[PDB]
Amino acid sequence: KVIVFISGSCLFGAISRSLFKKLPIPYTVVLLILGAILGVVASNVPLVEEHTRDVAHMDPHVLLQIFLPVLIFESAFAMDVHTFMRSFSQVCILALFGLVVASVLTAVLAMNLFNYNWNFSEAMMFGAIMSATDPVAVVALLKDLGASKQLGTIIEGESLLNDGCAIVIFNVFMKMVFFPQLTSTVGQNVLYFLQVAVAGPLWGYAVAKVTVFFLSHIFNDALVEITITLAATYLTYYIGDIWLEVSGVLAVVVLGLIVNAEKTSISPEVEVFLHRFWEMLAYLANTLIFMMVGVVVTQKALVAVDKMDWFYLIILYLAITIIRGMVISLFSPILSRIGYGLTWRNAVIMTWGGLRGAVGLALALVVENLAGNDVIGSKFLFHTAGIVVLTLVINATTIQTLLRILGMSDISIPKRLAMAGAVRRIHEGQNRTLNMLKSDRFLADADWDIATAACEISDPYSAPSPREFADMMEEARLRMLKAEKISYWKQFEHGMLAREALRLLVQHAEVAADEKDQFILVDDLKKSWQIKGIYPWLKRKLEDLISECHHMAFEVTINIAIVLNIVPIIMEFDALRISNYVFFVIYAIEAIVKILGLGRHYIVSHWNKFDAFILVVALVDKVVKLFRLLRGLRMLRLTKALIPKLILVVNGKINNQLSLGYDVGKGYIIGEEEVGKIIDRMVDNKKILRELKHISETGRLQVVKELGLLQREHPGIAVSVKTRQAIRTILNHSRETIHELQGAGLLDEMEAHKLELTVEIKMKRLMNAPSSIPPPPPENLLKNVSWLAGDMKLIDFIKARASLLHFDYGEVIVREGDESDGLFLIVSGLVKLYGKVFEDYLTVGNVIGEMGVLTKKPRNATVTCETTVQVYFITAEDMNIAIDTFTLYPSLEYRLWRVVAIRIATPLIMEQMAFQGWTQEKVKLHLERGYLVDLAESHFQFNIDATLEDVILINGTAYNAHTREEIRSPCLISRTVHKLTFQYTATEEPRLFVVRNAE
Amino acid sequence: KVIVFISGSCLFGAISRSLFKKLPIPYTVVLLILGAILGVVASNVPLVEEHTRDVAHMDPHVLLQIFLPVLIFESAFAMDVHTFMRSFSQVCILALFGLVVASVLTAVLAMNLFNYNWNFSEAMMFGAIMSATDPVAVVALLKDLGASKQLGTIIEGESLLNDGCAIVIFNVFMKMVFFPQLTSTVGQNVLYFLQVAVAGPLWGYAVAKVTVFFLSHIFNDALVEITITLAATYLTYYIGDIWLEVSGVLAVVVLGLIVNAEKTSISPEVEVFLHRFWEMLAYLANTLIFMMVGVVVTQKALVAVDKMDWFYLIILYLAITIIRGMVISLFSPILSRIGYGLTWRNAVIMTWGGLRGAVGLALALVVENLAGNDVIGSKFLFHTAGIVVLTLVINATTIQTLLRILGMSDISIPKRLAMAGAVRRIHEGQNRTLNMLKSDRFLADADWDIATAACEISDPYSAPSPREFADMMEEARLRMLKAEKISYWKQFEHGMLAREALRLLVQHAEVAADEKDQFILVDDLKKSWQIKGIYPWLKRKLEDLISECHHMAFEVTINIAIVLNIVPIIMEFDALRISNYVFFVIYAIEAIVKILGLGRHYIVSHWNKFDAFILVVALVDKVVKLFRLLRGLRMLRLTKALIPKLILVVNGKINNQLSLGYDVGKGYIIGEEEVGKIIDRMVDNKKILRELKHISETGRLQVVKELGLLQREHPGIAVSVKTRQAIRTILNHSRETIHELQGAGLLDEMEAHKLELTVEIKMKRLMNAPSSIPPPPPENLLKNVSWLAGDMKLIDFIKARASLLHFDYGEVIVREGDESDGLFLIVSGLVKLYGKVFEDYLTVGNVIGEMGVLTKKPRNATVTCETTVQVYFITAEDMNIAIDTFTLYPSLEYRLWRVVAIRIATPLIMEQMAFQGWTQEKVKLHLERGYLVDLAESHFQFNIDATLEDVILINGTAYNAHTREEIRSPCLISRTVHKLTFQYTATEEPRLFVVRNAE
């Protein structure tokens, strides 16, 4: 009865999909043609008619209750959220108002022109049944071309709201038409529309939050969470359909959108499996519905054919096209005023890319089935089939031409240059590999013509004067922007930036490059991280200032008793005497708790007052009915267990914003530093490079000062986000070391898998990080200095010899050219350093001035306080005493010298830059493995070996072995020198640093 | 009616699975307990009884027609094939005979002891229902421990055949019992059993091959593959269930096993999606069936309970355990004789790990439902539930103890050492990263205690004298085998070896290491690739020697007409007069074709005779019925279109064998060369290293000679496999270059994705490589020399000046110490080279003796022919003329010198070895980028710069700039030398080679 048709449907869909990949027309028109042929054969032959009758005419209920929710939910699940949320107001107003006006204009035009004695409800149904769209083909083509991502996002997101409102309007009007027994009270209809618009999405959001909370507590288990997600989606649909006839789809769409938004609490394999599952279901439904409508329209077309009926279809197509055009034409200025740059090219490509999908066909089938033996069903089916087959051919084939006429399909010159370079590199590499392979001792017999013919890559895209000064500065600006963009890409690929910060940086760089003479500006980034200054923060502050056997199990049991005692309230809204006895027991329990609280000084102000009032009401227990109804006010006492959840969620929101705001600034600073380092030797004119360096320095200084002030504003979030970043970096480098060990063959693959699983579990806990408000104490900062960890005696001696100082805003601590009084450690506040040309801003965690206590040199900086600062001061004499006291192999002077050597040697290695692809992190790690070598053991003579990779001289004077050149510190000695000779000078001790190989 | 129970089932399964991860007992016993509690509540409360009735007692048809096939097919799909196929006979005989004897012994024991007036059929049904197993828990635990992989494979594969035979026996005996109206003819039963045993698996294999053929022609499409596979599986099940009542499961198991075997024709994403889908379905069915039996057992156990009834369960458990033990006890010698080393520890752990799963519960539910109002159903259900809950607790908890008593759970010392080293490296790396991070300018505020306390990783495992000479040689052998194992792992990770070759090599290395004084031997590898010498090859040879408008469209249309004319032949087994006219037209067409063949000299011997006989039969058209039945023998003419398919499939099989046979030998040779190179400096005793080097050289020589002879045997397969290897290597290096370009940030990620997609399509075409019989011509080999490509004039001149020589076996071509007559090129055959100490074997594709034509030195080799050889010879004076003629920048002498320099400089770079993780391929690629520099332009003075990486002097004499040392070629000059001074000597021209940096 059903098996033959479904198997044939799967086979024909597979055949058409595989065979029509090259052709521009979609496979759906082919499926429609096959449905028509099957309809003709069923009309003639009785056997295939018998085999087709059972599925050709199904119930309307199964169609509009299974096929439509699957399609809508898949279309919601496939789409992302952030790109949709960036333009929510625009797409919302466009979809709603365009649908309303298109429906009403189509209805009145059908009434005026079709010459059918139709009520207004039928015309509204017809206008709503040709308002659904399906831009899947055109959005896929636009993604393939990659013209404008935001335009594709908007055209994809419009159709979802379009389909939702179309299904709502069609449902209510079909209920009005085909079941006239319902009462037409205006207030009842208003309440129904209100509950459709409100209760649906709220129910969907509630179940989405509940299922996300349950998903948040599952580790390394796949099956459980897949089953939970599927059961939750079906339960939402079932409840939303039993409660309201049509709101189920409007609830399940919100469910899918929200659960898709939370992509950081669902394992990637489950995500890809669910995506594949829902896409496969949508495919199956789509092919089935096209072939079904094909056979039914062929079987019921000969009895509804007329010359005027055939003529009306063209007029209908013209009408729908012109109204779709004029909607955007009328809405262009309003959508331009809101803050979105609508343009005529985007307008015309959007208004021309209006297709018709399976939703209109589904509603047509429903109407035709419900009409029974009448003419309106056949006319609806014929007109909608005609218009869909007209548009799906004509518009889908001419959309490519209309794209190619305009500039969307064009390819920029830089993309062509990059592709040409890449193809040249691939061809050179393949030629080199072939040349190496032809000289092997085993593969010297392969058919080389066949070998080199099969593997080949083809280019897919290919088929003093003021004017001179302006040209040079324009070229320099373009080169700087290009270097900044590739630095952002390299940083993202290394993993130091999230995707969102990368997208913001790339978009800002492209916008600045589009302008004639505008560099990248910090004001845009300033408003990018300025989202902290928002009214949710003020709400959090006000609710925090408004708000505030001793075991916690006591209060937990009280809450559990309250939850269990909720149920008799629902029972109210012998059998009742046992409940009354339980009530009296609860009253006695509350009395005992309040007696204990009276023993606990009863200092509660408002909660105690409300508890006393509720106890007074409970002691009392038509006026009887009101008393029994209103005695359940004690639920107000539960609100003291509800504030911490709100403060936790608002802290989570502010942390989620602050992480992005911090990441974008850090990425911009690192990229600017790298570009400023690399631009040194490329450019020729001195004035141009000087001006560019000044601009970059001004921007960097502004960004670092603003970010430091933002961190100073409130530490509870900054500490948490910094800790999360540190743990993520440590785990990433551990995973990299694990992969390196596995690749070197020193570890079996199963053990590598076990360690990777452990690292993945740690990363999952990091993602489920704790509450983001840990406050740090100053003693931990004092004991957490890089050259102080692991030495209890040193820590105790420093704590004994330390001092605490506090300064207000505007004070000056030390000045350059003065004697070095001691060492500093910024433990609270922000500080500005300026001395002779460079200017910097430091914050908590950074020490200041080791030169005075190592080299005994005068201060080379000037210190000012931008706010109230707390600092720890250590005298120089105590540091000298500690140096002369501890003489272990990890000596204090050893660690201080290592730290300053690393700090002063990083810029030189970065300045070399003969290598490419090395960032700050890689250079710091490579420099970290080294250890400085004392010259006392080597008798001030050093022999350079092949084992060591790179050497640096920090402080001292260098003498060659034979040429005897006097070299001043600090510099990187060349590989030319072989033996280093040194002399003992009391004024300055030489300092050398080496880096060994791997082993 | 059903919604509440299914949703509760999903919820309870999720809860128990998530909560009982730590506990040793399986989660299913919790589901059984929950089912019992729900049964009690349903017995008391009427509402839950109403909500449970609709699922507690289902129609048994849906149970044994849906739940069982899903479980069996998932268990078949999850298991692999190759490990199953390695021990097919053993598991087959064990499963079949053990099931038979267990069933009959359990039946007779029930008859003797249970004191129930039962027929023998009920006892046999009991024996069949107590024989089903489910080792999922124990095999998962054994994989986690990783004691013996083959034991896990055998214990997993036994249960599949056990379940299949159990369901078959249960089906036939239930049909005998509960439907006694069927006829009991012995011949009918024999024919039925034969058709069950034969027609099922053949039908499954046929549809498996058809669907594999259809899936073989789909590119970059995922949805079509999934839908086609699912539809094919369901169609196989439906046909196998319509035709036979029970053989559907036996067909679908073969379907799943075969489609899982072909893992090289299905995209990985489709594979993982299908695995996840079927695993999820099996999970859902499993939890639902446990809770259903839990809710039904309690309500029916109240009326069937006795002291002796409770007593019998323990006796039954003892009986099943002892019979399962004695089966293996009796089969130990027979299974030892076949060629498998059965041991008592594996025997006891296998016979103790016998569990009971959902299959027995399903069959018990079916019997209880079909019994209706009787006692036998309740007794079967109670006994099955009791035995399964007994074993799933007792055996599943004591299996870990019985494993820990024996040596399976022990951990070897090398694994502990490797884990200790890896954890030490991870800890050092984490400490280094933390030390670097604490000095950053942004992350100086993170709570360091929380940071360093979370990202921590701990090792999971921990909680002259002859005796001296023997110890040293044992240590040397262990170290050599170790280094060989790491060499194999590194080669596999680089990608040069397939998984099976790696598994064979690792297994052979472990077997050799287990023996006291046995090295790795080549005889095992000899029989590993000796599978070519098999009777399929002789069958192919005999069928090839037995067998042999002119457009091919003519024969194609003839075949199509034959295919369409098959249908009236089936119709045989006005309406008939038009068919008769059709056959007359076909006879006329055949007459025209044969007339044309007569015009084509009619030289066909056998096919022409059979065609003439069939034409004689056709011209003729109760004897009438026989003639009409036997006139359709013309189908014999189609067999000439079937032979090429057989030769293609047998060629594919022999190619699939030869690829592995070639890979294992190549991997062994490379690993032996690397270990011999690395063993030079590790060991101390000279005699030991000399003996090991001699052993390694003997093995390498034997392997290379045997592999060369195997290649010489037939070239049609060797050429194809070599070409496939070359194209795969080229594509892999192209993909690596693409990833490097993407990581360097010079290419946008979308373009990188496009290029990766193109490379993936090329790789898919490589996998769907053409027929593996391309024969090579000699002129292509002559023109495909490395220093001859790209020069048409040079190729033509060489072809004009070339000569061809042929030699027989045993002849000697040239001898050492003689004048260099010319240059050699082996274009056919195999050749042995021996001269003074090293001995080698060369084959087609390798040139011989460039030293005589470059350095004008006497021959240093002796050449013998191991078989008939064809050689191209080029005279020395012609090469001198070509050298003195061509003077372009890519000169001939330039290319020859580059080739010899690379060949002679690879071993020095390998011997240098200050580096790890570099193979022959990486060293060759690094050496390839270099170019030799002429000293005429530099006036015989070279200045070493920092840009160049490595330099190597091939021929000449080296002098330092100042120290003036005389250095003899060939050697790698150290980094110490700065400027190279050279002099002009007519007797020897200096030759230098450099390698530059990346840019």
Closest residue of chain A to B482, computed from CA coordinates: A746
Q: Do B845 and A445 touch (CB under 8 A)?
A: yes
For tokens 């192919």, what's the residue? Answer: B540
Long-range residue pairs from B617-620, CB within 8 A, at least 24 positions apart, any chain: B618/B583, B618/B587, B618/B590, B619/B587
Residue B506 and residue B667: Cα distance in Å, rounded? 11
Contact status, residue B511 vs residue B484, Cβ threshold 8 Å: no
Q: Do B432 and A925 touch (CB under 8 A)?
A: yes
List Cβ neighbours of A676 (8 Å cut-off, separation of 6 or more).
Answer: A693, A696, A697
List Cβ neighbours of B944 (8 Å cut-off, separation of 6 or more).
Answer: B951, B977, B978, B979, B980
Method of determination used here: cryo-EM
B741: left (phi over 0), alpha (psi -120 to 50) or beta: alpha
List the single residue in A226, A272, A754 with the smallest CB-CB distance to B460. Answer: A754
Contact status, residue B447 vs residue A776, Cβ threshold 8 Å: yes
Residue A641 and residue A561: Cα distance in Å, rounded? 14
Closest residue of chain A to B437, computed from CA coordinates: A726
Closest residue of chain B to A741, computed from CA coordinates: B422
- Helices A686-713, A522-529: crossing angle, 10 deg rounding: 10
Angle formed at CA B83 by CA B80 and CA B86, multiple of 5 degrees: 140
Q: Give me the amino acid identity at A220.
A: N
How many residues would you count in chain A?
Answer: 999
Q: Which candidate, A358, A341, A407, A393, places its Cα nearest to that of A154? A: A341
Q: What six digits make up the tokens of B459?
A: 């090792």
Q: Do A899 and B998 touch (CB under 8 A)?
A: no
**Strand, coil or helix: what is A707?**
helix
User: How distant is the alpha carbon of residue B511 from its chain centre?
Assistant: 21
Contacts of A145 in chain B (CB under 8 A): none
Burial class (CB in 10 A: 0-12, 13-18, 19+), A510: exposed
List the single residue in A277, A436, A725 with the smallest CB-CB distance to B928. Answer: A436
Residue A329 and residue A348: Cα distance in Å, rounded? 9
Mutate to test the interface with B, among A6, A230, A417, A445 (most CBs of B within 10 A): A445
Q: Please state the domain extents for chain B.
A: 3-405, 412-438, 551-641, 729-775, 778-886, 895-995
Mutate to test the interface with A, among B436, B741, B925 (most CBs of A within 10 A): B436
Gaps (C–N > 2.5 Å) in chain B: which residues precede them? 463, 548, 573, 621, 836
Closest residue of chain A to B751, computed from CA coordinates: A419
For tokens 């063959």, what's the residue? Answer: A745
List Cβ neighbours of B379 (8 Å cut-off, separation of 6 or more).
Answer: B116, B304, B309
Beta bridge partners of A931: A994
List the single residue in A731, A743, A997 with the smallest CB-CB distance to B455. Answer: A731
For A3-405, the fitting CATH number among 1.20.1530.20, 1.10.150.130, 3.40.50.300, 2.40.160.40 is 1.20.1530.20
List Cβ neighbours of A666 (8 Å cut-off, separation of 6 or more).
Answer: A496, A497, A707, B442
Beta bridge partners of A207: none
Closest residue of chain B to A841, computed from CA coordinates: B441
Q: Do A719 and B434 touch (CB under 8 A)?
A: no
> CB count, 10 Å around CB of B417?
10
Residue B670 and residue A442: Cα distance in Å, rounded? 11
Q: What six digits make up the tokens of B834?
A: 């021996």
Q: Which candidate, A287, A371, A283, A386, places its Cα nearest to that of A35? A: A287
Q: How many beta-carbon pairs below 8 A join chains A and B?
A: 308
For tokens 């009280």, what's the residue? Answer: A558
Residue B518 to residues A860, B472, B689, Cα–Cα distance (Å): 73, 16, 16
Contacts of A446 in chain B (CB under 8 A): 719, 722-723, 725-726
Q: Which candidate, A894, A891, A890, places its Cα nearest to that of A902? A: A894
Residue B739 and residue B602: Cα distance in Å, rounded? 61
Q: Is the peptide bond before A970 cis (omega within 30 degrees of 0)?
A: yes
Long-range residue pairs from B272-278, CB within 8 A, at least 24 positions apart, any chain: B272/A269, B273/A273, B273/A276, B273/B226, B274/B77, B274/B226, B274/B229, B275/B77, B275/B78, B276/A222, B276/A226, B276/A269, B276/A273, B277/A277, B278/B70, B278/B73, B278/B74, B278/B77, B278/B78
Residue B577 to residues A548, A658, B360, B574, Cα–Cα distance (Å): 102, 88, 60, 5
List the single residue in A455, A786, A974 with the smallest CB-CB distance to B438. Answer: A786
Quote the longest CA-to-CA distance of chain A: 115
Long-range residue pairs from B636-640, CB within 8 A, at least 24 positions apart, any chain: B636/B610, B637/B562, B637/B607, B637/B610, B637/B611, B638/B559, B638/B562, B640/B607
The annotation places the binding site of A for 3',5'-cyclic GMP at: 849-851, 859-860
Q: What six digits make up the tokens of A395?
A: 């518009």
Contact status, residue A997 vs residue A929, Cβ threshold 8 Å: no
Residue B32 and residue B24: Cα distance in Å, rounded? 16
Contact status, residue B520 vs residue B484, Cβ threshold 8 Å: yes
Q: What six digits make up the tokens of B122?
A: 């009920």
Q: Which candidate, B703, B699, B718, B702, places its Cα nearest to that of B828? A: B718
Q: Do B221 and A17 touch (CB under 8 A)?
A: yes
Residue B201 and residue A793: Cα distance in Å, rounded? 79
Contact status, residue A283 vs residue A276, Cβ threshold 8 Å: no
User: Residue B988 has what DSSP assignment?
Assistant: B
Beta bridge partners of B830: B843
Residue B693 and residue B688: Cα distance in Å, rounded? 9
Contacts of B444 in chain A (CB under 8 A): 844-846
User: Residue A776 has what DSSP assignment?
Assistant: P
The annotation places the binding site of A at: 849-852, 859-860
Burial class (CB in 10 A: 0-12, 13-18, 19+), B93: middle
Q: Do B746 and A421 touch (CB under 8 A)?
A: yes
List the single residue in A758, A843, A998 with the smallest CB-CB distance to B457. Answer: A758
Beta bridge partners of A959: A966, A981
Is residue B890 within a helix (H) or strand (E), and if so which, with residue range?
A: none
> CB count, 10 Å around CB of B797?
16
Burial class (CB in 10 A: 0-12, 13-18, 19+), B468: exposed
Closest residue of chain B to A223, computed from CA coordinates: B280
> CB count, 10 Å around CB of B114?
18
Q: Which candidate, B142, B127, B392, B141, places its Cα nearest to that of B286? A: B392
Q: Do B280 and A227 touch (CB under 8 A)?
A: yes
Nearest-Cα distance to chain A for B152, in Å, is 16
Mutate to test the interface with A, among B12, B278, B733 (most CBs of A within 10 A): B733
Closest residue of chain B to A899, computed from CA coordinates: B439
Quote the longest CA-to-CA distance of chain B: 115
Beta bridge partners of B862: B834
User: How distant is the alpha carbon of residue B546 from its chain centre?
Assistant: 34
Q: What six digits make up the tokens of B733?
A: 């290096």
List the single residue in B421, B727, B925 with the smallest CB-CB distance to A455. Answer: B727
> CB count, 10 Å around CB of A191?
11
Nearest-Cα distance to chain A for B429, in Å, is 7
B778-886 sits in which CATH class? mainly beta
Q: Do B751 and A419 touch (CB under 8 A)?
A: yes
List the single residue in A723, A747, A947 with the smallest CB-CB distance to B451. Answer: A723
Gaps (C–N > 2.5 Å) in chain A: which residues precede them? 463, 548, 573, 621, 836
